[PDB]
Every structure is written in structure tokens, then in C-alpha cells.
Design a protein around this ligand. Structure first.
Ligand SMILES: Nc1ncnc2c1ncn2[C@@H]1O[C@H](COP(=O)(O)OP(=O)(O)OP(=O)(O)O)[C@@H](O)[C@H]1O
Ligand SMILES: Nc1ncnc2c1ncn2[C@@H]1O[C@H](COP(=O)(O)OP(=O)(O)OP(=O)(O)O)[C@@H](O)[C@H]1O
Ligand SMILES: Nc1ncnc2c1ncn2[C@@H]1O[C@H](COP(=O)(O)OP(=O)(O)O)[C@@H](O)[C@H]1O
Ligand SMILES: [Mg+2]
Ligand SMILES: [Mg+2]
Ligand SMILES: [Mg+2]
Lengths: 54, 468, 45, 503, 482
């Protein structure tokens, strides 16, 4: 009985952990996209300012 | 030809000539200076005005001050008389031992060797370091890279390489400190004086020194590498002997170029580097090659900003080096010195047709088991080590043993760790790592393989720990 | 598309990387102790 | 003799003089010369300086003409005279370039005498239109089991070799060049493939090593090595891909089949960025100019498979892109991925995991698909691709595969054996029949009982056995091009016998 | 009117004054305006001179006469500046009267070469257990106190300042360290509080506070580190040892960026000039240890870098890290976890290392460092003998490293405390009571066993007799306390 209960609870806990990890993954993916766009914009602005100040 | 200074903006000095316009890459002497100030012609701005980069401080310069032209690029005193003598970017001796009386003078700017002059042969240079001689072996007459961040151990590694190779090298050696600390330069000078490599009393020195440090203006740090490689070029071509060229750090050449680029009048490239980054880096690097006349073994230390190897300055250098040694901060933080990354270091001679089947098999097995350990670390993070199977626990233990056995004390690092420096022969490294892969030492603790030389020392340390 | 690789847990250096390092060190300290005891018993022979 | 032939050469040379169009250098710096005058200069036209250096007039500004220098800028002084050649840049072309190492302009740098080229072809000719081309059908055997199986390449297809540094891109290109030996020295004309390797931004020692490797393999006799090393000026590195593309277009137009390998197109992009920035052209993302997608697009589109009306020739392009930390979202990687048909993706993790070559079959794609395969290779490769996809679906459970479903364990075993089959040594290309035989022995479940570590030894021994004793079956497969039912039964018997006798 | 030794302002804006004339002005030469404001000629353009104004520009207007001074910008230097709070130009601002300095020194003098320097030998005692034990700082070394805002960088600097008092009022001339503090960008209230702290600890009598506050013009904030560097160089070249603190170089970089951008010089990475690395490199390279041929002096440098959200991989922090010999990483996470000073000993390094460190401290610090490394290996989350004992020992050592503010410790007392911690005399006590035990043990040893501390200080190492006596006293005090 204990091993059956333990396996069932292990499956449920791993499923919950996977769901939480996926939620964190999508949130961090949105953050990563924002950061990537910000980095590209910042570097291009630096290049443009350097060219214009010449 | 005499010209007048019209602009002294920063380290960039604009000189206007009237009769004879000097060609680009010409050394200009500034009259009226208490010391010797040299300006290198970088651009022709037109209207008989040239834009120049100063090789020393620009303080005290006044518009209208007279400037001469040498008629040739920066010429350094070169020959066998420069051994044991430290010299500046422009060739002036800075060791207070008098002038470098030599019969030859060579311009630091020269054409790269042609395609027909390239030498395709490549031996293996055993260095005594386990990681280097095992996974990324060095080749005689080949370009060597020491990629690493700030504090990973590039300087200590290159000092150990100098200790192991330069003394055993029959030919001459050249060290070109580019944009580094003057304290390190003084330490190296005194160490080589007390090691007999540089002898002040008589002319038996084997190492020349070229030093432009971080206190120098960016113009100076962008040319010391050229001066050192020019001395190496003389030792390679005019004399048929083999040459050792140690550069630390080569990144400062690119950094100095970037520092002068903005004032030179260039639109900045990516991450603020000069648009001519790859061009100038290649022009410098192609000169440091093994020709048919002679062979130059170059061991260049490359600073990686923010430990980001995707930065353009270290990224472009990868194509210029045969064997590369990447020192990683993560490995150093674990205490494993040298911090060479086993899964990132590469060597062109790493091939069964060159290093033999056994060496290649051992190296590939080590790399494969370390990669599998990296894969299993993620599982251990969540599952737990005690919950792993019995099969992969053995793999993890072997990987830990291999990681610790890659570490090795250095003679130059005795002051820090306190361990006696070791120099393991190639066959001993191959046998030890093959035995570890075979599991012959699965009964020894992983602590026994940390900071040891040959595998016999590992078993000795194991039994000594068992005695206590 | 953004992807990942092997051994990225310790690279992030977060809670899980430190947890994995500590777990490995604690396990292998016990294993080293056992191996040292066995080696001492063998050396007594 | 030497003096006599020297005097014969000098008397043969005629010192003619004529009018020209000339201009003065207003300002020279960083390899960019601002030239006053030169009113009647075409855009992208070769011009030569007084010092002997050549140049390309790119910016035709009103006051001055901006010209890039094909060499060191120290030899160009303010006021020097820039003559006008009167022609757009062109390179020598023909069969005479085979076996020779030439620079971006076609000048011989191998020291084997002048090129006996009889024809001169430009570097900026337009690619063939929609009508002249035809659908790619003929295979381009690279000699790698992974490529010829899962990522096939046809003649006339732009296939990308993308990956980080030190992953095997140059090795893949060089073994593709080596593999074509079996077709060139043979008799079938429509199978010969002339390779053209363009080296961009690479040290001369590396190019010399590559040339020695090709010469030892007897592959130089049908290969052209266009070299624009890192020492060479940025304009030469910019022009080298176009010069190689024209050299391949010559073979393409004459009905022959050419293979062009632009090594490190990223370095060509860097050189073009340097030229554009020094010309004060407006920059863009990562300081690259706006017309940087144009640069690679008008180059790779010249790779095409002409129809029978135009000769039936072809030009296969294999660009190489050096990504940084596997970031394919960067500017040049995105451009080249969009331009080309597919890509062969290499990963450092797979390289050090024992999977050499490091081809990541999950990310590597081929839009031409199975249409560029032989019938036997297609037949085995469909099954292998499906099984490997199924394995990669369930590859996460390999760590805890012992306590898994029987189907999952079967898939894991089959995928591990197929992956062990995909491994291949360096500079050892395999014939198409040998590859199809190995893949047949794998997919048909003749390796499930065998130990996964013993696949490589079994593969080598089986290849030796089939080459030695069963050469007739391999020849029949090669000639027919398909694994027929009779050949299927013969292969079944052979693999069963060898598997029984392997232990 | 003369146009060679004087000129007029073409245009004045945002502290930059374009000058027509000054045909004989030199690069970086200090010029003088009509209103009394002084300047510095940075841009010698073909038809104008770009002068940065050392002060408020409201008093400078078009047509004002600009006159040369004939000398590159220099700062009053000497030992008279001890106990004085000066500005970037050396003028006294504490209302104590004029400075009696008889000599002047350029602010942009070249750093010493390879020959004049010698190895770093003498230790630079800071009074901090963590620094003096695990990240030792030598005399002539340059250590970067890097971290985020409100982590304790200025606290470490001022504690180092105070600790030198015991040496400065002592007898021997070879241990005196004449401190110098440079305040760049800080508000005047903070500088006043700092000098009040120094006066309270009587550390002002041997220190020089060069302040270029936020209200001061950008050129003053850019010139302040070089002024203090020259003041330290005076001691360095005269056989005396000096300590210089740049707090903080990030604000100096910001000021230099403002100056360069206002001078129409093209921006670079993060709008900073191309030579931001040079700006600090030519400054920190002037921190050297002269040999006996040059008097044997030294100039220890303690630059301070402010990192945004712990982004140690930023432009200026990476430049300064590459320049310096060692880094003292201060982390806010360790700060809030009760570890104060928040010195991350895992990443904190010292290139000189054991080369400049007293023998007893090195002997005990090797064991402490090994134990703390093992603890960090097994810190985060069950052998009682192997892991739990190691974990407890690491916790005891971590609580030992914690130290109060403005209370530097004598080196021998630190050695005694670390010896007590290392040799298993605190594993029995609760981790909470470790600080109380340390305070009580400090009091007892400094009261009764001053002879033992004197023996340790004079010998420089703990010998067998000293070790036995220290074991005896620590056992007795452990028995009495618990
Ligand atoms: N199939 C293979 N098996 C084993 N080793 C291989 C294989 N392919 C390549 N290598 C090795 O991998 C290394 C890198 O190969 P290669 O030079 O082709 O890579 P690359 O990514 O194109 O290089 P680079 O980025 O330096 O231009 C070489 O040492 C080569 O011998
Ligand atoms: N060793 C210490 N023990 C206790 N508190 C400390 C310690 N060091 C610093 N603090 C606390 O930190 C605060 C001031 O820190 P400090 O000024 O040294 O940091 P900082 O990083 O230099 O700051 P800022 O960026 O504001 O200049 C005060 O609240 C003080 O109590
Ligand atoms: N055997 C070793 N090899 C390399 N570094 C070591 C070794 N032992 C200790 N170290 C530590 O590594 C650091 C490397 O310093 P350094 O070579 O200056 O790094 P970098 O040159 O990258 O700035 C030293 O501070 C030293 O304490
Ligand atoms: Mg270094
Ligand atoms: Mg390659
Ligand atoms: Mg502060």
C-alpha cells in the first residue's frame, strides 16, 4: 500500500513541478525577449550616436 | 620635411606639412620635447595635413610646434644585442643599462609572409601540463591561444609555460608585454634575472623583452605587439633559429585600436570596436607564423572581457590560432588550477594520424565522460545523488576523479598553493588518464587526485591519507 | 528559437546549482571516507 | 636557357602607351581613398593607382569618388594619380584554374606559373531567372552518412553549414570535396563535380594545410582554392565569394557541375561592414550596412540548376556561418538562413558527446527534401528519419529508461544504434552504396541484439566484408540506383550471415 | 591685443569655453579666465581652444580675456596637507587657513617603470578580519573594493583609514601609512560626516581628504583622483608609505564622460569616451612599491566601483577589475544575511596573496581558508563527523569573520581570535554567542595577556611556546565563559 501511494504521489508532485517550471519558463521567455530587443536597440542607438557625433 | 602641429585633440595629433607629405605609417619626431615623442602617421586628412597617433603623452604640445619625419616607420634596435634588454614601443631601452648597440634596425610594420612561404609540418610540443598535453596539445612552430577572463590564470599559465619551455628551448625567446601591469613586468624581469635566462654580467641571455604597459597612451599599446613580433621576425628570418614569442596580453592591442578609433574619425563598429578590427588583427597575426626560413612558436594570452567569448575581440582570434586553451572561471572557483576548460580547448594536432590512436582515444574518452557528467549534473540537481542508479554513480565518480586529476601544481604557482611544482611527461599523463577511465582507481578517494603529478603520486597521496 | 543545452543548471549558479554541488560533495565525502577506511584496512594487511 | 627565355619574355612584352582617365587622391586613410576627378567612372569599376595597387570605385559622390584599395594603404599618398581601367572587376575563368590556388582577383599564389585562362568573366553578373532553372533532382553525395541520409543536398541547392567555431564545418566541406573523387576520375560525365573552395579571413597556414590535405587525397586536380586571407585587404575578402561564384558559373553555363564552398561568409560580411563604415555609409543593426542582406542574396541566388535548354549544368553553394554561442537569431545568421534552402547544424555539445560529426539532425533541415536522393538511399532514409524522430521524442527518459515501457525501451535502443551508425571518422567519405548498405543493416533491426558500443567496430568490419567479397551487389546497387526486392533479399542474406559470424 | 599668450572666449556653454587665440597654449595647460575662474585646455583645435572650466560658468561670458599660466595643471603637494580637507585643485575648504605647501606636482605625471619597482613585501593592515585573513592587501598593491550601493565599500575604506592610527602614532618609521581619501561625486554632507568620523577616531592627523563633490564642476571631479594620486606620490618618492582611496571611480568616469561629450568628442560604449580604460589605467598604475634605490616608499591604492544590481560584467567595472591586482566583492545578499562586512570570500582574490602577510596570520589563515572553502562546498541545501562537523566549523568561522563598524582590530588580536576559531574552541558554543565570546575574549586578552600579544607582534609568528600559552588561555576563558 505504501509503495502504491508513494508512486502515485511522486507522479502527482512531478506533474505539479513540471507545470510550475513551464509557467516560469514562459515568464522568463517573455522577459528574455524584452531584454534581447532592449539590447539590440541600445547597441544600435550607441552606433547611431557615435556616427552622428562624428 | 618639417610640419606643424595644428590639432592636439586627445592622443591624436594633426600635423600639417607644406613641402613633403609623409606616407601613412611613418614615425614623426616632435621637436622641442625633453624626451623623445614619436607620432605615427595614420591618415591623410587632405590639404597637406596628416592625422597621427602619439606614442607617448601629448601634454605640453602646442599648436605650431615643429615636427620632423623619419622617412620610414618606427625602427627598433634589433639583433642578438637586444637579448636581456627591455625596450620601449619605439625601441628605446628602459632597463637603464645603456643604449642597445646593434648593427640592425627593422621597421615594426612589414608585409605578412606569402602563401608559398608557409610551412605545413607540425610536430607536438610537450609542455608537461596534463590538460594541455592531453586534450589540446601544442605544436612546435604553431600559434597558441590562452583565452581567459580576469583572474582565471592566464598570466600564471604563461609564466609556467615560459619556465617549462623557454629554458628547454634551444633557440631564442621574446616576451612582449602588451598593455599589462608594470608590477607583473618587474616580477618577470627579476624572475628571469635570477633564473639565468637574462644575465646582466655577460651576453648569454636568451629572452628579449618589449614592454608597453597600461600606463602608456593607447597609441603605444597598439604597437608594442608589433615591436615584439618584429624582434621575433628578425630572430626567425635573419637567423635560422627557432623563436618563442610570448604575448600578454594581446587583447590590449585591439583595445588600444578601439580607444584611438573614435578620435581617428571612424564610425564605431559593433560593441564599440573599430571597424578595422579584423583587418588590423589579421595583419598583426599573419606576421606571427612559421615560415620555411624559421619557426616562431607563439603563446599569446588573450583577455576575454566579462568572460564572454562571443565578444568580437576574442572571437576573431580563434581563427588565428592552431591550439586554443580556454580558462574558465567556473573551474577556477572549484579550485582546479589550471582552469583550462576540457570541453572548450581545441588543438589542430589533436588527431589519431598525428598524436597516435591511444592519445586520441584517451582524450576523446575524457571529454565524453565529462560531457556525460555535465548531462547528469542536471538530473542530480532535482533527483538527488543518492537516488541515482549504480551505473551512473560510477560515471560521476570517474568524472570527478578526472576533473581533479586534470589539476596540476605549477612551479611559478608555488608561492600561492605551496605544493611542489610538477612536470608530468606525456606518456605518464596518457597512462594515468587511461587507468582512471578503466576504473583501476575507483577504490581511491577523489581527494587523492587533486593537485598531483603522475598517477603514482596520486596513489601515494591516497595511501598517505589512509595512514592518518 | 531559443533553446538550451546539457549541464545548464550549474551554469546559472542559482539555488539548484548550489543544491546539486552540495549534494554531490556531501555524498562523495562519505564515499571518500568509506574508501579511506577500506584502504587503511587493506594496508594493515 | 633562363637568360634566353627571360629575354624572349621581355621582347614579347610590348610597352604600349595610350590616353586614360585619371584623378588625384584627395585623402587616403584606412584603405579608403577619396579621389578628385575621374568624371567618367562607372560604379563598381576597377581603377589602378600610380603605385600599382588596384581599386574599386564604389561611392561616386559629386565632389570625389570613393575607391577601396586592394592592398596596404601606405603606398597611396595624397595627390597620387588614379588611372581608369575602364571595366568592371572580372576574374580569369576556365578549366585552367583547376589545381591552382588563386587570390580574389585570380592571380596565382601557388607559384606554379601564370594561369592559362582564355576567358574573362565578371563578378557581379545577375543570377538566372525563374524560367532557366529547373527543380533539383540529382544528388550531391557529400560522403557523410548523416548528410546523405537525413539532410540530403542536390545539385543546384544552397545548403548552409552553420554552427559555432571548432565544430567541423570546414571538415564537412573538405570531405565533401574529397568524396567527389570517385566521380571525377571515373567515366560518367554527368556525375563529375568540380569543387571550388573559397577561404575568407583565414590564416595562410590553415589554407596551406587544407591544400596539402587535398593534394594528399588527389582532390586538387578538380578543385579551385580562391584565397582571401586575413592579411589581405577587406575588399579582397569581399570580392572572393563573387570571384569563386563566377568561377563556378563558368562550369554551370557549360553543362558541367560545380560545387562552391564559401568558407566563413560571416568574415566576408565583416569585411563588407568595414568597407561600408569607412566609406561613411549609414550603419544598421550590429553596424552592418542596410545592403548586407543584398550582399549575400545576390551571391547565393547565383547557385542554380539550369534546365536542359541552357546546358543542364549546376552550381551547388555551401556557405559557412560561424554563429556565436549558437545564436542563430543574429543578423548575418538570420540573413543566410533565410536566403539558403536548408542548413546543416553542428553543436559543440554533440561534438564532445561522441557524436562526430556534430550534425544535429533535429535542427538540420533540407527544403529540397528526399527529391535529392537515390531511390535506395531515399528508401532507407525515410525509415531512418522516422525512427530517429521517434527516438528524439523519447530521448529525455534515457536516464531512467530501465523502468520504462517496452515500446519506449525499444525506441531508445533503436535510436542509440542509429546514432552510433551516424558517427563517422574524418577524411573518410563513404560511397552511396556503402552508406545505403549500412543504413539498411541498421533500420531493419539487425543491430538490436548487438552491444551499442560495438556498432562502430561492426560497421567497419561489415563495410570491409561487403567491399571485399560482395562487390557485385554494391556495384549493382550503384548502377541501378535502387534497392530492388532481389537486392533486398541478397542484402538480408548477407547481413544475417555477417551478424551470425560477427561473434 | 595679443593672441599668443592670451585670448577671448568665443562661446561658453555647459562649462566648456571655446577660446580664440592662445596660440602658445599647451595641451592640458591650466588657463585663467577674467573672472578668476581657472581652466584646462583639452582640445587644441586649429582655430579654437576647448577649455574646461574649474567651477561655475555663469561668471564666464563671450569676449572675456583668457590668459595662460605657462604650466601644466599641478596641485600643491607636501606633508603640510596632512589633517586638511582640500578640493581637486588643492585649495583648502575646511576654513583652517591656507596650505603651507612649498612644492607643486603635476597631476598627470607618468607612472614608475619596471626598474624602480620592487616586489610587494610589507603588509597593509586594514583592521578587518576578512581582509587581513583571506584577502590580504600588501603595501603598494591596488585592491578594488567593488560592490553595489549601500554594501559597505566606504565603511571598509574608513576602517582601513582608522586602523593605521596604531602605526602612525608609534615609533618605527617603516610602518607609518599616510592615508589619503578622495571623494568623487559624493554630497558634502557625506564628506562632512566622514571627516567627523575621522576626527572622532583621531585619524585626521595623518590623512588628506580631497573632495570633489557633486556640486563641483565635472572637470574638478575628473581631476580629483589625480590630485590625490600626486599627493600620495610625494610620500612614495620620499621613503614614506601612503594609502589612497578613490571613492568612487565610477563617478569620475561619469564626469569624464560629461567633459568629453561636451567637448564634442564622439561617444563610445555606453556613451563613455574611448579612453575610459586609459583614464583609470594611467591613474592606478601610479600605485607602486619603490625599491631601496628610490627611497623604498609605496602608494597603496583602494579604488571603489559602484555596480548596478551586481552587474560585475559592466564596462567600467570590467576595466577597473582588469587594471587592479585584486577585488573585494561586496554582495548585498551577504549583507542582509547578517554577514557584515559582506566580503564574498569565494570570489574575493588578492594577486599578491601570501607574499605580503605576517607569518602567524598566514599560518592560521591557511587552515581557515581551507575550512571555509570546504564549508562553502557543503554550505547550501548527513555525516556528523564529516559533513555536520565541517558545516558547524564553517558556521563558526563565518560568525568569526563578522566584525562591527568603525572598530578595526590589531593584527595580533586577529591572529589570536582566528587561532581560537580554527583549533576547535568555539564548536561547543552556540553560533549566536560567538560574537559575544569574541568581544569578551578580546577584552580579556587586551587586558591581562598584553604580554602575549606583544610577543606575537614582535616575533611575527606564533611559535610552540606561544601556541601552548594561547591554547592554555583560550581553554581557561572557554571554561570560564560557558
Ligand atoms: N568527424 C570528425 N570526427 C572527429 N574529429 C573531427 C571530425 N570533424 C572534424 N573533426 C575535428 O574537429 C576539429 C575542428 O574541425 P574544423 O576545422 O572542420 O571545424 P570548424 O568549426 O570549421 O573550424 P573553425 O571554426 O576553426 O574554422 C579539428 O581538430 C578536426 O580534426
Ligand atoms: N561592517 C559593518 N557592520 C555593520 N553595518 C555596516 C558595516 N559596513 C557598513 N554598514 C552599514 O552600511 C551602511 C553604510 O554603508 P557604506 O556607506 O559603507 O556603503 P557604500 O556601498 O559605500 O555606500 P554608498 O553607495 O551610499 O556610498 C550603514 O547603514 C552602516 O551601518
Ligand atoms: N597553478 C595555478 N595556475 C593559475 N592560477 C593560479 C594557480 N594557483 C593559484 N592561482 C591563482 O589564480 C590567479 C591568477 O592570476 P592571474 O594570472 O593574474 O590572472 P589573469 O592573468 O587572468 O588576470 C592568481 O591570483 C592565483 O592566486
Ligand atoms: Mg594577467
Ligand atoms: Mg573551420
Ligand atoms: Mg560609500
Amino acid at each position: 500500500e505504501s509503495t502504491t501511494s508513494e508512486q502515485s504521489a511522486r507522479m502527482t508532485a512531478m506533474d505539479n513541478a513540471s507545470k510550475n517550471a513551464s509557467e516560469m519558463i514562459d515568464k522568463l521567455t517573455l522577459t528574455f525577449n524584452r531584454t534581447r530587443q532592449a539590447v539590440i536597440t541600445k547597441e544600435l542607438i550607441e552606433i547611431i550616436s557615435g556616427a552622428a557625433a562624428l | 620635411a618639417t610640419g606643424r602641429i595644428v590639432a592636439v585633440i586627445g592622443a591624436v595629433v594633426d600635423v600639417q606639412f607644406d613641402e613633403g607629405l609623409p606616407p601613412i605609417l611613418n614615425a614623426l619626431e616632435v621637436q622641442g620635447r625633453e624626451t623623445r615623442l614619436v607620432l605615427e602617421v595614420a591618415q591623410h586628412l587632405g590639404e597637406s595635413t596628416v592625422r597621427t597617433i602619439a606614442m607617448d603623452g601629448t601634454e605640453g604640445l602646442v599648436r605650431g610646434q615643429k615636427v620632423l619625419d623619419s622617412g620610414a616607420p618606427i625602427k627598433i634596435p634589433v639583433g642578438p644585442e637586444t637579448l636581456g634588454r627591455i625596450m620601449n614601443v619605439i625601441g628605446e631601452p628602459i632597463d637603464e643599462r645603456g643604449p642597445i648597440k646593434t648593427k640592425q634596425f627593422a621597421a615594426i610594420h612589414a608585409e605578412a609572409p606569402e602563401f608559398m612561404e608557409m610551412s605545413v609540418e607540425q610536430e607536438i610540443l610537450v609542455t608537461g601540463i596534463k590538460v594541455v598535453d592531453l586534450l589540446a596539445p601544442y605544436a612546435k612552430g604553431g600559434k597558441i591561444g590562452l583565452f581567459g577572463g580576469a583572474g582565471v590564470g592566464k598570466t600564471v599559465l604563461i609564466m609556467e609555460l615560459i619556465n617549462n619551455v623557454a629554458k628547454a628551448h634551444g633557440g631564442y625567446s621574446v616576451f612582449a608585454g602588451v598593455g599589462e601591469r608594470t608590477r607583473e613586468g618587474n616580477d618577470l624581469y627579476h624572475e628571469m634575472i635570477e633564473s639565468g635566462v637574462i644575465n646582466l654580467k655577460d651576453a648569454t641571455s636568451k629572452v628579449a623583452l618589449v614592454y608597453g604597459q597600461m600606463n602608456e597612451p593607447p597609441g603605444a599599446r597598439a604597437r608594442v605587439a608589433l615591436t615584439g613580433l618584429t624582434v621575433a621576425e628578425y630572430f626567425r628570418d635573419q637567423e635560422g633559429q627557432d623563436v618563442l614569442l610570448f604575448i600578454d596580453n594581446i587583447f590590449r592591442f585591439t583595445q588600444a585600436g578601439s580607444e584611438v578609433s573614435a578620435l581617428l574619425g571612424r564610425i564605431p563598429s559593433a560593441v564599440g570596436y573599430q571597424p578595422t578590427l579584423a583587418t588590423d588583427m589579421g595583419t598583426m597575426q599573419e606576421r606571427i607564423t612559421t615560415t620555411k626560413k624559421g619557426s616562431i612558436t607563439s603563446v599569446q594570452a588573450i583577455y576575454v572581457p566579462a568572460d564572454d567569448l562571443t565578444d568580437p575581440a576574442p572571437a576573431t582570434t580563434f581563427a588565428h590560432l592552431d591550439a586554443t586553451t580556454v580558462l574558465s572561471r567556473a573551474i577556477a572557483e572549484l579550485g582546479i588550477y589550471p582552469a583550462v576548460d576540457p570541453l572548450d580547448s581545441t588543438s589542430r594536432i589533436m588527431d589519431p594520424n598525428i598524436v597516435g590512436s591511444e592519445h586520441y582515444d584517451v582524450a576523446r574518452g575524457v571529454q565524453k565522460i565529462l560531457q556525460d557528467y555535465k548531462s547528469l549534473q542536471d538530473i542530480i540537481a532535482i533527483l538527488g545523488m543518492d537516488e541515482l542508479s549504480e551505473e551512473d554513480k560510477l560515471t560521476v565518480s570517474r568524472a570527478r576523479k578526472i576533473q581533479r586529476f586534470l589539476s596540476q601544481p605549477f612551479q611559478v604557482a608555488e608561492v600561492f598553493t605551496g605544493h611542489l611544482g610538477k612536470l608530468v611527461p606525456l606518456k605518464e599523463t596518457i597512462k594515468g588518464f587511461q587507468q582512471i577511465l578503466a576504473g583501476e582507481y575507483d577504490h581511491l578517494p577523489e581527494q587523492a587526485f587533486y593537485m598531483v603529478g603522475p598517477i603514482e603520486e596520486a596513489v601515494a597521496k591516497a595511501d598517505k591519507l589512509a595512514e592518518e | 528559437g531559443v533553446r538550451s543545452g546539457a549541464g545548464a543548471v550549474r551554469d546559472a549558479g542559482g539555488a539548484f546549482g548550489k543544491k546539486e554541488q552540495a549534494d554531490e560533495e556531501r555524498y562523495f565525502r562519505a564515499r571518500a571516507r568509506e574508501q579511506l577506511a577500506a584502504l587503511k584496512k587493506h594496508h594493515e594487511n | 636557357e633562363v637568360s634566353s627565355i627571360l629575354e624572349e619574355r621581355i621582347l614579347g612584352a610590348d610597352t604600349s602607351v595610350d590616353l586614360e582617365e585619371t584623378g588625384r587622391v584627395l585623402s587616403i586613410g584606412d584603405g579608403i581613398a577619396r579621389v578628385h576627378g575621374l568624371r567618367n567612372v562607372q560604379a563598381e569599376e576597377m581603377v589602378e593607382f600610380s603605385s600599382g595597387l588596384k581599386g574599386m570605385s564604389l561611392n561616386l559622390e559629386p565632389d570625389n569618388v570613393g575607391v577601396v584599395v586592394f592592398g596596404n594603404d601606405k603606398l597611396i599618398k595624397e595627390g597620387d594619380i588614379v588611372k581608369r581601367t575602364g571595366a568592371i572587376v572580372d576574374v580569369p575563368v576556365g578549366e585552367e584554374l583547376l589545381g591552382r590556388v588563386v587570390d580574389a582577383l585570380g592571380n596565382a599564389i601557388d607559384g606554379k606559373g601564370p594561369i592559362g585562362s582564355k576567358t574573362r568573366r565578371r563578378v557581379g553578373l545577375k543570377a538566372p531567372g525563374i524560367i532557366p532553372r529547373i527543380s533539383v533532382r540529382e544528388p550531391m553525395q557529400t560522403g557523410i552518412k548523416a548528410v546523405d541520409s537525413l539532410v540530403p543536398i542536390g545539385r543546384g541547392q544552397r545548403e548552409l553549414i552553420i554552427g559555432d567555431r571548432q565544430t567541423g564545418k570546414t571538415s564537412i566541406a573538405i570531405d565533401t570535396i574529397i568524396n567527389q573523387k570517385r566521380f571525377n576520375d571515373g567515366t560518367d560525365e554527368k556525375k563529375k563535380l568540380y569543387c571550388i573552395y573559397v577561404a575568407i579571413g583565414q590564416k595562410r597556414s590553415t589554407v596551406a594545410q587544407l591544400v596539402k590535405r587535398l593534394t594528399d587525397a588527389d582532390a586538387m586536380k578538380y578543385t579551385i582554392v580562391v584565397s582571401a586571407t586575413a592579411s589581405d585587404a577587406a575588399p579582397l575578402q569581399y570580392l572572393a565569394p563573387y570571384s569563386g561564384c563566377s568561377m563556378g558559373e563558368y562550369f554551370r553555363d557549360n553543362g558541367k557541375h560545380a560545387l562552391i564552398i564559401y568558407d566563413d561568409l560571416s568574415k566576408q560580411a565583416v569585411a563588407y561592414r568595414q568597407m561600408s563604415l569607412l566609406l561613411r555609409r549609414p550603419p544598421g543593426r550590429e553596424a552592418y550596412p542596410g545592403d548586407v542582406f543584398y550582399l549575400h542574396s545576390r551571391l547565393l541566388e547565383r547557385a542554380a540548376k539550369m534546365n536542359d535548354a541552357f546546358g543542364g549544368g549546376s552550381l551547388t553553394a555551401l556557405p559557412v556561418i560561424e554563429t556565436q554561442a549558437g545564436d542563430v537569431s543574429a543578423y548575418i545568421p538570420t540573413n543566410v538562413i533565410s536566403i539558403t534552402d536548408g542548413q546543416i547544424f553542428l553543436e559543440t555539445e554533440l561534438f564532445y558527446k561522441g557524436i562526430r560529426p556534430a550534425i544535429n539532425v533535429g535542427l538540420s533541415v533540407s527544403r529540397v527534401g528526399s527529391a535529392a536522393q537515390t531511390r535506395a538511399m531515399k528508401q532507407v532514409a525515410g525509415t531512418m528519419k522516422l525512427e530517429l524522430a521517434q527516438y528524439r521524442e523519447v530521448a529525455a527518459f534515457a536516464q531512467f529508461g530501465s523502468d520504462l515501457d517496452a515500446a519506449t525501451q525499444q525506441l531508445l535502443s533503436r535510436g542509440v544504434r542509429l546514432t552510433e551508425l551516424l558517427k563517422q571518422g574524418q577524411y573518410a567519405p563513404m560511397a552511396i552504396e556503402e552508406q545505403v548498405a549500412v543504413i539498411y543493416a541498421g533500420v531493419r533491426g539487425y543491430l538490436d541484439k548487438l552491444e551499442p558500443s560495438k556498432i562502430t567496430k561492426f560497421e567497419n568490419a561489415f563495410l570491409s566484408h561487403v567491399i571485399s567479397q560482395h562487390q557485385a551487389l554494391l556495384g549493382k546497387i550503384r548502377a541501378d540506383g535502387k534497392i530492388s526486392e532481389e537486392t533486398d533479399a541478397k542484402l538480408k542474406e548477407i547481413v544475417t550471415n555477417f551478424l551470425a559470424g560477427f561473434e
